[PDB]
Symmetry: none
Subunit: 131 residues, 7 copies
């Protein structure tokens, strides 16, 4: 299982980053957004065999789509909200709801990163980059 | 043969699951429906050379389409009602009748899982996930 | 020589079956129709180098189209009425006549199996299933 | 060189067969027509390097197209009337004339086999069958 | 180098043939035309790496297009009038002139063989046949 | 695949290679100008595409071809910015640089020996050939 | 180790690209290149190197070069696109650029005169690199 950064190709310098809550990166429910690439622990990810992106911040922290379509890291489970797959430079969640669309990892403005309906995902290019 | 869980891609957390009879998940004629994924032995399946999805609850328990399009596990035989094949993420039964349609594994309501005529099957996406 | 059962995909449980005559499956001239699958010697077939389906019931017994479009097993010969080939899940005879048509292995009611014009063969899907 | 019978797929039992003359199946100029399959020396053929179909009845005996489009076996030579080639199940002569057509090996009624202009050849399917 | 006869497929028995002078097939400048196939040395040819068809009648005798479109054998040189290439069963000269047409080896009547402008070459099928 | 040392020669100008000019004759300088020059193959004309899609100059360690905000080119210490990432489509050499203008930027000769990146639809002298180059240590 | 080739025209029954040189001396830098009947001596033998230059065998370091007036010479080998050549079928194309918006093709322009010509006007521009 390769350790990578998830670097945007839609922004000259933005990597997927665990902000956390109040300086602590390791907390469950910690927010995930974007930040300049420094490759520190809170910017390193690994894709496990259940298609979860595991954070290197702490054991059992997974990239998780929330109801409001923000991103957090959470304990690892079997929910589709923690499953991801690549189509080219697009990183796509398996999360489903009533809207009949796929959700793509996407910059929504400034350093904010969420998931967005596929047709409205305009800053949604990423590169898994070997550490 | 490879043992898998059959997890829905149409529902954020649902696995094909042997309900059984009165809590007992090993009896022939036991019911099959959906449940949150946990991977225990009554959510584990294997596709044999005769195209039957054998359940890991006990020997001789094959996923079977009934006359009323509901699902059980039964002793393994040659009926097409026990035969399955994949097309992409659709899991299709060989079962035939007067209606001249193919039937697909489908979530009809909530945690109820049946087979459904292909043209009306809208929660019928599945992924065979290795255990 | 690849041994198979010929199971219908148009019927939930039917295989091509040598009924035989008077009890005996061994006999030449014996009838062929459908039965539930058990894979015993009289439901197993093998396609030889001359495109004949030879039954495991006994030596020298090939699936044969009759003029009544009924099916039997007979002594092996050169005749086209004994030649078969696949097109997807259709099993087609090389038998020719005036109707300018191809004949398909087909279920023609209940457990009865015969060859039927391609245009009219509504239950003619088959799956040759490897056996061992 | 593979020894084959030349069996029609347009008739339920007919193989290309050396008749001979008044009995003698080795006579040069002997007739070739159709007959029930039995795979004796006079029904076996080999396609040689110069595209000739040589009969097993004797040395130096090729399948030959005549002026009146019937068929005999003759001493082997260079003439295009003794050259044959396959296109699918059609067996085609290299014979040329003023009619601007290819000539196909073809059943012209009963057991009479001859060659026929391509557009007119309705019983012209053949299978070279390894004896 | 493969020795071949150049047999016509547009005539039932015609091979490309060095006529020579006075029965001597070896003479430089000797005429080339058609004859019935017998595959003696004046009907055997070899295509060399410079695209010349060399005759076996003697060394240094290449098939040559003359300005009046007749064919001779001559000493081998670099002229396009001696270069030949195949497209299907057409044998095409590299000869050029102001007419902007390719010239094809063609039977122009009886046993007369010449090169003919492509669009009029109606007896221009050939087969190179290993000796 | 091992990093191949190449020159980057224009196919839009009869003799122009991408060249580190440096500053005051010092070709090794961080932030030194890159432009065009006639081809001679010395270290300040030799480049290598690394695993992070950066074109490293042979002039010295840690020098990558970089798009500046005014679209001129320099060599700078190597990092993660898209302004140092490059990829080929045929004979076009394209920057991963992004801004608000809805365009890809291509390596392009903008006049004489000046080389910049230019919006794709205006990039008229933008053909290049990476040419394998022997380098002596 | 470059393959020896002559560059033989396919638009003329006997013409090869040929170093004429200067004052009878075929080795000289600046020497003229035009056409001649094919004999395959060294002033007609060429090799395509790894920089896409056609090197002549008359001497070390003599490359086929397009001049600004579109005539051809041999010159010291360097990086100029005026010395680079590539094939598309039987067309031999220069990488030379100028303000005219055209590719230039090796072309016979009358008699034994060989130059490069704009693609759209090059009517005697077929060639074959012929292995010696
Ligand atoms: C308590 C507190 O705010 N501490 C901050 C750290 O959060 C901060 O680390 C950075 O945090 C951002 C999110 O705002 C992002 O996650 C960066 O990757 C991470 O390095 C640190 C550096 O700015 O300053 C502390 O004071
Ligand atoms: C007697 C009785 O009802 N016992 C139940 C178990 O059935 C139950 O196990 C779960 O059963 C559901 C079906 O309703 C499904 O098959 C689950 O996968 C299975 O684990 C257990 C947990 O709910 O509770 C017992 O009391
Ligand atoms: C002296 C003389 O004319 N001898 C001839 C032979 O040339 C001739 O050979 C045949 O000639 C034809 C061309 O006319 C062709 O080249 C044949 O391949 C070649 O065999 C021979 C046979 O007719 O007769 C002699 O009289
Ligand atoms: C101090 C000074 O100006 N020295 C110059 C060198 O810069 C120069 O080298 C050439 O510089 C050009 C850029 O102008 C390009 O980088 C060439 O590759 C490089 O060789 C040299 C030759 O022009 O002259 C020195 O005096
Ligand atoms: C001094 C002088 O003119 N000498 C000539 C040779 O140049 C000449 O060689 C031929 O020259 C032509 C071009 O004119 C072409 O390059 C031929 O390949 C080459 O052989 C030679 C033969 O004509 O005669 C000498 O006198
Ligand atoms: O009518 C001629 C026939 O004579 C007999 C022979 O066995 C047959 O093969 C056939 O040639």
């Amino acid at each position: 299982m390769a350790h990578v950064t998830l670097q945007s190709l839609s922004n000259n310098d933005l990597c997927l980053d665990v902000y956390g809550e109040n300086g602590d990166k390791t907390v469950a429910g910690g927010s995930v957004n974007g930040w300049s690439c420094h490759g520190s622990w809170n910017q390193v990810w690994g894709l496990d065999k259940e298609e979860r992106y595991r954070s290197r911040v702490a054991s059992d922290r997974c990239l998780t789509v929330n109801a409001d379509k923000t991103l957090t890291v959470e304990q690892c489970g079997a929910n589709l909200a923690q499953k991801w797959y690549w189509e080219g430079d697009k990183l796509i969640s398996r999360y489903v709801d009533g809207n009949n669309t796929r959700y793509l990892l996407n910059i929504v403005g400034g350093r904010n990163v969420q998931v967005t309906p596929e047709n409205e995902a305009n800053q949604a290019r990423w590169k898994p980059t070997l550490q």
